[PDB]
Design a protein around this ligand. Structure first.
Ligand SMILES: [K+]
Ligand SMILES: [K+]
Ligand SMILES: [Mg+2]
Lengths: 62, 114, 93, 86
RNA sequence: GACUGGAGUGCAGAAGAGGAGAGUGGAAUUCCACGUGUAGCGGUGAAAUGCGUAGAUAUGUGGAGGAACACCAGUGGCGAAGGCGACUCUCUGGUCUGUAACUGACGCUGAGGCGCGAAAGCGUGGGGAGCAAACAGGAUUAGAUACCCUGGUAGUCCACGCCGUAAACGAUGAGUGCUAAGUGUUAGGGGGUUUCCGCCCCUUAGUGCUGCAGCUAACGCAUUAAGCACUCCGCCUGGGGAG
């Protein structure tokens, strides 16, 4: 069951580090749909958000 | 004098094992070639163990009880080398990876028989 | 068009210096064809990795409206050229 | 091409106050779009994917234009000088 | 002359690695300097050529340079095709869904033309880290103008302009309609139920799997037909010579 689709929260923001940190590994890697329970649309959107955060140094690479 | 870091470079050809200080100055090293091997026998877990043991029992020049170990490459001798460093009489504190992975940067050379 | 901006100011800056830099980039945005509706801070928070010997930094926000984007472009080049902004980003809503 | 400008240029050439689906309206809006894209191409000459849609607009315009010519010729000889064709 | 199921505009939404430009990030290969540092490293089926006490290999720090962008990432998205994967902004194209507002057949194809068009390659000027045709050396071999190893120039990258080929392939031309199902998956809409959530069913455009009829020489295609029919274009008429 997807978080965002089950909760109706459609927007994702690259600044909610506390909520995006649930989906990066300890080594800094995004995780797949089957492991995170997400859906396709929101998983694209989480990729975009995570990458913007990483490039703002808000999340790490490693 | 109390703790060191071990760097093992294990490959499908040879195994190097270097003991250094935590801020990166060499104290000792060894390999299968300095151990006395000459061919594919370099690439073996036995050579890995023996070079590890020689390295550690020279590292007991300035002394230590503890190691953090860092493993590089696909060489099969990492298990034997880590067992060597545990069983020589040192408390290996943790194992870690130095897999030099590029995120699709510079390309490899060609495959074989092409 | 609704524009959002974020940026990071370095740690070695006192409060007067820092507010001067903030106000200066705000002036550069609003003196052009744009009007800052809001500009904000999180705080001197920890960077996920080190850009320089620096590892802390001042996270700031600017919510904005604009049509020309020369504000965006001057802000971008001037913030890269200044020794105070190590990071900034601009996004269209 | 913005909505407001689009509304302007449909309502100022609409044949009557309800209409926004006439060939007059379409040909006008297309001439706006193709001129903006001519500028776009003269800047970014090698965006051939954009040049594709350009030529599709031009073709649709010519199609509407021939239909109008066949339908009522006065509308045609009006629009050409009202818009800048030919 | 008239009408709206085709075609298109409007209106409300949704996705997207669709394209061009400019800038930007860190991994990571190499190189430069400096410490620590001692005799090997590399590679193979074995080796050897080669690098190394004028000090490597590695290890840490800092700096330079360019090329491509892990995870996400998936018979998933988009595009006419080629093809398009790091991020942001600007300029742009096209698609789908719903409405029945607007025009009222405005359409389908499309010879001859016009443009685009992987990689290699060509001209001019840069850049050139890696990989690497050619080439050199070492092995191999009966021989080896090769596979194999160590090096390595053109190139690969960029700007501009040519070249216009491809196993350029779904080896399957574009368009329209009709003719059983089951099931994933993507982007939407509608309705029943329920506290949203969640489940269910119906429907639109895609994308895939398996299958009925029917077709096929068979393999197999099967609402993404290679079925049933109509329009249009291109092409074939034994192999080779001969593209
Ligand atoms: K060239
Ligand atoms: K292809
Ligand atoms: Mg080329």
């Amino acid at each position: 069951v997807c978080y965002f689709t089950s909760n109706g929260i459609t927007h994702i923001d690259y600044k909610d580090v506390e909520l995006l940190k649930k989906f990066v590994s300890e080594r800094g890697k995004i995780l797949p749909r089957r492991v995170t329970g997400t859906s396709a649309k929101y998983q694209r959107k989480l990729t975009v958000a995570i990458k913007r955060s990483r490039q703002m140094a808000l999340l790490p690479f490693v | 004098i109390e703790s060191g870091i071990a760097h093992i470079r294990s490959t499908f050809n040879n195994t190097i094992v270097m003991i250094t200080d935590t801020h990166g100055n060499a104290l000792a090293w060894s390999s299968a070639g300095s151990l006395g091997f000459k061919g594919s026998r370099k690439s073996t877990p036995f050579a890995a163990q023996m070079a590890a043991e020689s390295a550690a029992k020279s590292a007991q020049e300035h002394g230590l009880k503890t190691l953090e170990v860092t493993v590089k490459g696909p060489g099969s001798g990492r298990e034997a080398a880590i067992r060597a460093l545990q069983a020589a009489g040192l408390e290996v504190t943790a194992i870690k990876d130095v897999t030099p992975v590029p995120h699709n940067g510079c390309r490899p050379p060609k495959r074989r028989r092409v | 068009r609704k524009y959002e901006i974020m940026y990071i100011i370095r740690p070695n800056i006192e409060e007067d210096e820092k507010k001067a830099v903030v106000e200066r980039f705000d002036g550069i945005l609003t003196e052009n064809g744009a009007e800052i509706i809001e500009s904000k801070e999180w705080g001197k928070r920890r960077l996920a990795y080190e850009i320089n010997d620096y590892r802390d930094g001042f996270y700031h926000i600017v919510k904005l409206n604009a049509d020309k984007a020369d504000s965006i472009n001057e802000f971008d080049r001037l913030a890269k050229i200044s020794d105070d902004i190590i990071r900034h980003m601009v996004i269209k809503e | 091409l913005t909505q407001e400008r689009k509304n302007e240029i449909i309502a100022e050439y609409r044949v009557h106050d309800t209409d926004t689906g006439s060939p007059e309206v379409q040909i006008a809006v297309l001439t706006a779009e193709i001129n903006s894209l001519n500028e776009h191409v003269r800047v970014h000459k090698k965006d051939h994917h954009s040049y594709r849609g350009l030529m599709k607009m031009v073709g649709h315009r010519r199609n509407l234009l021939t239909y109008l010519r066949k339908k009522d010729v006065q509308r045609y000889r009006e629009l050409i000088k009202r818009l800048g064709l030919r």
